[PDB]
Design a protein around this ligand. Structure first.
Ligand SMILES: CC(C)n1cnc2/c(=N/c3cccc(Cl)c3)nc(NCCO)[nH]c21
Ligand SMILES: CC(C)n1cnc2/c(=N/c3cccc(Cl)c3)nc(NCCO)[nH]c21
Ligand SMILES: CC(C)n1cnc2/c(=N/c3cccc(Cl)c3)nc(NCCO)[nH]c21
Length: 295
């Protein structure tokens, strides 16, 4: 409605509706308290700037600066997330929808990697369609670069070294090697995507809803269960290509450049085999799509 409206409640701050005075267009204002003892917003801004707004499926970024008691980052206003659309579609997606998502997100993640960044926060909440009117509703955008990292050193142009005993993104989708505390690299982004694709097809993953003693133990139980769930069991009654995908990405080496084209062709060949047309008729098309604003 009017600018200044709260349009999102984030983990580190909030999201408000703004206007671009140059165009009269609505924009998104991401806010983080200046008092934050774990500031993330400026890091994110710097990453967005390294990516640029050239490659498709990245929000345009306009501004970073202090705004009252907040730091403010202003960027392109988008539509709902894949998780919201998953909820709208009663928490399963068709194969056709999942393949259209997968093919696009493989290009998106490749682009991110091409800019020397690893993403490290794959989850459905972080992939948003464009707004309805704005003719980019078919485009799946990647957002939230707060957990990202430069994996090629700017100075030496060398890949970051291998390391262990690391922190611990989001437990539901993270790679097995992330659970083991290994430094994440390009492979881990692709494995998390694969877990997300299987989440969409199945409706859930078998390491969801586990009970723990503490956060530490839940991460442990989830990681243990991922290892104990064979890909064959995980992908039972879905096309073999899903299992082929998971095997490939699980078997990538730390420094290895993924063959993104191989993975996209795996899904495109299945897409053609099934007789599907890439018409952007996702499952949610024809349903009432949430919109952040009208005008
Ligand atoms: C690039 C980031 C800062 N960005 C841009 N647009 C959005 C966004 N748009 C909304 C917000 C509320 C409802 C809807 Cl349908 C879209 N939501 C979110 N997050 C969900 C908060 O409601 N992030 C957005
Ligand atoms: C009335 C308030 C809620 N409002 C409305 N629109 C904006 C706003 N819009 C911007 C700021 C920078 C670039 C662009 Cl394109 C829009 N920014 C801000 N704050 C960031 C710049 O001070 N506030 C805005
Ligand atoms: C691209 C830049 C010049 N730009 C475009 N629109 C804005 C902007 N929009 C506002 C701010 C306050 C109220 C309203 Cl309605 C819009 N604010 C700001 N504030 C930050 C200083 O420019 N910048 C804006």
């Amino acid at each position: 409605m009017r600018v200044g409206k709260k349009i999102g409640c984030g983990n580190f701050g909030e999201l408000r509706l703004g206007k671009n005075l140059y165009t009269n267009e609505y924009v998104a204002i991401k806010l983080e308290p200046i008092k934050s003892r774990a500031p993330q917003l400026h890091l994110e801004y710097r990453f967005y700037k390294q990516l640029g707004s050239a490659g498709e499926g990245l929000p345009q970024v306009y501004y970073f600066g202090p705004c009252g008691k907040y730091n403010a980052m202003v960027l392109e206003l988008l539509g709902p997330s894949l998780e919201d659309l998953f909820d709208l579609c009663d928490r399963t997606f068709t194969l056709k929808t999942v393949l259209m998502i997968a093919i696009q997100l493989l290009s998106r993640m490749e682009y991110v990697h091409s800019k020397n960044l690893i993403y490290r926060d794959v989850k459905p909440e972080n992939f948003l369609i464009g707004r309805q009117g704005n003719k980019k509703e078919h485009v799946i955008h990647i957002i939230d670069f707060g957990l990202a990292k430069e994996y090629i050193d700017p100075e030496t142009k060398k890949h970051i070294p291998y390391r262990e005993h690391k922190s611990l993104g989001t437990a539901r989708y993270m790679s097995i090697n992330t659970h083991l505390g290994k430094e994440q690299s390009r492979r881990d982004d692709l494995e998390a995507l694969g877990h997300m694709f299987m989440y969409f097809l199945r409706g859930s993953l078998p390491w969801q809803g586990l009970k723990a003693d503490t956060l530490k133990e839940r991460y442990q139980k989830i990681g243990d269960t991922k290892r104990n769930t064979p890909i064959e069991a995980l992908c039972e009654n879905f096309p073999e290509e899903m299992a082929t995908y998971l095997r490939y990405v699980r078997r990538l080496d730390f420094f290895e450049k993924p063959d993104y084209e191989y993975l996209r062709t795996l899904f495109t060949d299945l897409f053609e085999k099934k007789g599907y047309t890439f018409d952007y008729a996702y499952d949610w098309v024809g349903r009432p799509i949430p919109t952040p604003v009208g005008s």
